[PDB]
Amino acid sequence: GMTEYKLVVVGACGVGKSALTIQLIQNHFVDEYDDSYRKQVVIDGETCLLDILDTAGQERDQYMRTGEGFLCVFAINNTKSFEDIHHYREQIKRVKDSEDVPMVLVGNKCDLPSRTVDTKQAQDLARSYGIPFIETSAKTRQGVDDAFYTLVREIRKHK
């Protein structure tokens, strides 16, 4: 039937993995609560179904082996979350057993004023991995559709 793309949101705890996913599926912003979500979207004329796989703390290859594309998310107010991207990127290539895994670098919480990671820092890392970089904010919905839709276009090109 219609193509179904399996997406996985990886990143440190509290960067915005859940809020970005909830903002995409339900148009809702989450502050504090405690999964798997599906949604039908239209990208570049074709209609498809998005299956999002949000990640928590320790538990993991079975979660990543099913993911076709991966979102590596960090928060601009958290300096540590940026250096964690290397380990996440390092594990994606191992579990998927490939170096050209479709992924997008996402810098969340661009709404916040206190910028601890300048813009010129994350994009050069995305150039190192050869992947796009998109500033997002789960509060203002800025770039939320962009990050997920771009990840789908990466998956459609590798075929």
Ligand X SMILES: *CC(=O)NCCNS(=O)(=O)CP(=O)(O)OC[C@H]1O[C@@H](n2cnc3c(=O)nc(N)[nH]c32)[C@H](O)[C@@H]1O
Kindly list the residues in this chain that would bind ligand X in the complex (CB under 6 A). 13-14, 16-19, 30-33, 56-57, 108-109, 111-112, 137-139
Decide whether 47 or 140 has the Cβ nearer to ligand X.
140
Helix (H, G, I), strand (E, B) or coil at 100: coil
Compute the least distance from the CB of residue 65 to ligand X, in Å.
21
What residues have CB less than 8 Å from 151, skipping those under 6 apart? 5, 7, 69, 70, 71, 102, 103, 104
| β-strand partners of 69 | 7
Pairing relation of β-strands 36-43 and 46-54? Answer: antiparallel
Amino acid at site 102: P
Compute the least distance from the CB of residue 25 to ligand X, in Å.
13
Which residue has its beta carbon closest to ligand X? 138
Decide whether 21 or 129 has the Cβ nearer to ligand X.
21
Compute the least distance from the CB of residue 52 to ligand X, in Å.
14
Max Cα distance, the chain (Å): 46
Decide whether 138 or 155 has the Cβ nearer to ligand X.
138
